[PDB]
Amino acid sequence: AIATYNSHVELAKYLVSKADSVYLTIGKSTPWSNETNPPQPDENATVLQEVIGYKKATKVTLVRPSKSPEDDNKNLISYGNKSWVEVTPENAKAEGAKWVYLESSIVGDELPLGTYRQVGFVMDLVAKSGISKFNLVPSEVESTGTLLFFDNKQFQNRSEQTTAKERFIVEVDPNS
Amino acid sequence: AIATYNSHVELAKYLVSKADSVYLTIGKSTPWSNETNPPQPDENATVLQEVIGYKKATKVTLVRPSKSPEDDNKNLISYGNKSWVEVTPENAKAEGAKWVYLESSIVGDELPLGTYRQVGFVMDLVAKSGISKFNLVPSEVESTGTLLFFDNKQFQNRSEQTTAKERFIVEVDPNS
Amino acid sequence: KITGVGKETIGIKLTERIVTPDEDASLLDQTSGVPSYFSKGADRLEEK
C-alpha cells in the first residue's frame, strides 16, 4: 500500500531535525578512470572514495518551488534555473514542503588542499571526544555515521581564496 | 537528486522508533457506491472517513522477505501468501530490511462492532489524561497524531466471537 | 559532605562560560526562526 504526500513531508521534517549530525563530505582527490566523464553514483556505496574529510552542513531546511508575487519578499534560494523558498517545520503541511535543501561551504583553508571529485552529505557523524570543530578529516571522526546523498564531480580544484559551495535539493522518494 | 538504499533503511528505523505512538484505525462503516469496487485511496486524506476508533499497534518492526535455510533459525510471519522474517534496528543495514511491518488486533467489541471498509495506521496519537487502554473511540483521544498509511478495502464484519487482526507490509519508497 | 572533625567551611564556587547558538537553538533569530538566514548571531557569557 501507498505512502502519502504528507508522509514525505514528515520524513523531511525528521531529516531537518537531524541537522546537527549532517556533514558535507568531499573525496576522490585522485583521477577517475575517465576524468572527462566520472563513473555512476552507486547507491550501495556507504562512503566516498579517497575521503578528504567532512564539514557540518551550513543550511538544512524544508523548501518548495517559489511563486511570484507573493513569495518575492521571503528568504529565496536559486537552484537548477528555479527559485525556491525556505519553509519552517510547523508550516510544512500548510505549504506542502516535501523537499529538503542541504548546503555547506568549505571556507578556504579549513581542510587539506587541492582537488575533489566526490561530494555528499552523511548524517550521524560522531567525532572523537574533545573535538568540536565543524570541519573534520577522517582521522578525527569516531563514527562516520551514514552516507545519505551524494554525487560524482569533475576536475575542478580548491585553494585558499576559492571557498567552494556545495548543495542539493532532494526528497526521500524522488519518484512516487 | 537520489536517496541511497541505506537511507530508506534508516527512515524505516525512524518509523520503528515511533512505534510507541502507533495506532491502527478502522472506518468507512457505511457502503461505497459499488461494494464490489471501492474508490481508489487518496493520499491527501489526513484521517479515515467514518472513524470507528483506534487500537495501539501490537507489532511494529523491520522485516524482510524470508528464505531457506538461513531464516529457518528465526521468527517467521505469514502474510500475502509470502513468508516474512523479523529484523532488529542495529541489524537493519546488514539484513537490507527497508520494509516495515505493522499489525494490530481488535478482540470482540472493545471497539463498537459492525462493518469497516477503511484500514489505516497513525503515529503521534495521544489520549486524554489517564486513558491508558489500547482501544479508543475518537472522543477519548486528545490528539489524532498523523495517518501514515491506509487502504479502501471491500467490507468486512467484526463480531463478539472475532478478533480482527489487520496488518500492512510497507516501505517508505515502494518504487525505487 | 564533611568529616565531622576540626574546622569545616562550606562555600559556593561560580564558574563562567561563553555559550554559542550552535549549543543553543534559542540563540537563533526570531526575525526568521531556527537555523535559518538572519539566525546564527551572538554568543553569551553565563555564570553558575
3-state secondary structure string, chain B?
Answer: CCCCHHHHHHHHHHHHHCHHHCEEEEECCCCCCCCCCCCCCCCCCCCCCCCCEEEECCEEEEEEECCCCCCCCCCEEEECCEEEEEECHHHHHHHCCCEEEEEEEEEHHHCCCCCEEEEEEEECCEECCCCCCCEECHHHEEECCEEEEEEEEEEECCCCCCEEEEEEEEECCCCC
Which among C32, C35, C37 has the least Cβ separation from residue A19?
C35
Length of chain B: 176
**Is A35 at the interface with chain B, CB within 8 A?**
no
Residue C32: DSSP 8-state: S
Rounded Cα–Cα distance for residues A132 and A169 (Å): 27
Handedness of CA C14, C18, C24, C29 (dihedral sign): positive
Shortest Cα–Cα distance, C12 to chain A (Å):
27
Count of residues making up chain A? 176
Tell me the chain B residues in contact with residue A151 when contact means C-beta distances shorter than 8 Å: 1
Angle at Cα B8 formed by Cα B5 and Cα B9, nearest 5°?
90
What are the percentages of helix, strand and coil residues in chain B, rounded to 5?
15, 40, 45
Cβ of A61 and C36 within 8 Å?
A: yes
Report the residue from A60, A75, A89 with minimal CB separation from C32.
Answer: A75
Residues 6+ apart with CB under 8 A from C23: none
For residue A112, cis peptide bond before it (omega within 30 degrees of 0): no
- CA closest to C39 among chain A residues: A59
> From the CA of B113, how many Å to the nearest CA of chain A?
25
Instruction: Name the method of structure determination.
Output: cryo-EM
Q: Which residue of B has its CA nearest to A122?
A: B7
A86 contacts C37? CB cut-off 8 A: yes
- Chains near B with 3+ CB pairs less than 8 A apart are A
φ/ψ region of A159 (left if φ > 0, alpha if ψ in -120 to 50, else beta) reads beta
> Do residues A167 and A103 make contact, with C-beta atoms less than 8 angstroms apart?
yes
Q: Do A88 and C35 touch (CB under 8 A)?
A: no
- Residue B67: CB partners within 8 Å, gap ≥ 6? none
Backbone angles phi and psi of B157, in degrees to 5: -85, 165
A-proximal residues of C, 9-48, CB under 8 Å = 32-37
CB contact under 8 A, B4 and A176: no
Residue with cell 555547506: A104
Scanning A21-148, the segments in alpha helix (DSSP H) are: 92-95
Cα A55-A56-A57 angle, rounded to 5 deg: 115
Q: How far apart are CA B14 and CA A126, in angstroms?
A: 18
Task: Report the chain C residue with the minimal C-alpha distance to residue A18.
Answer: C35
Nearest CA in chain B to A15: B11
Chains C and B touch (3+ CB pairs under 8 A): no
Half-sphere exposure (Cβ direction) of B124: Cα atoms closer than 13 Å: 11
Element (H, E) at C15: none
Cβ of B2 within 8 Å of Cβ of A43? The answer is yes
* Nine cell digits for residue C32: 526568521
Nearest CA in chain A to B168: A1
Cell of A136: 573534520
Residue B26 parent element (H or E): strand B23-27
Q: What would the DSSP string read from start to end of A162-175?
A: --EEEEEEE-SSTT
Q: Is B146 on the interface with A (CB under 8 A)?
A: yes
CA A23 to chain centre: 7
In this structure, which amino acid lies at residue B127? A
C-alpha span between A123 and A43 (Å, rounded): 15
Do B172 and A46 make contact, defined as CB atoms within 8 angstroms? no
Calculate helix-pair angle for A5-17, B5-17, nearest 10 degrees. 90
**For chain A, which chains pass the contact test of at least 3 CB pairs under 8 Å?**
B, C
CB contacts, 8 Å: C36 with chain A: 59, 61, 75, 86, 88
| Residue A26: closest CA among A124, A111, A134, A126 | A111
Nearest-angstrom CA–CA distance, A147 and A122: 4
In the structure grid, which three cell numbers stand for residue B5, read together?
538504499
User: Can you name the residues that pair with B167 across neighbouring β-strands?
Assistant: B103
CA distance B64 to B101: 9
User: A interface mutation test: which of C30, C34, C40 has the most A CBs within 10 A?
Assistant: C34
Cis peptide before A89 (omega within 30 of 0): no
Of A59, A60, A88, the CB nearest to C33: A88
Asked if C36's CB is within 8 angstroms of A86's CB, the reply is: yes
Chains A, B: CB contacts under 8 A, how many? 93
Return the residue matching grid coordinates 540563540: C27
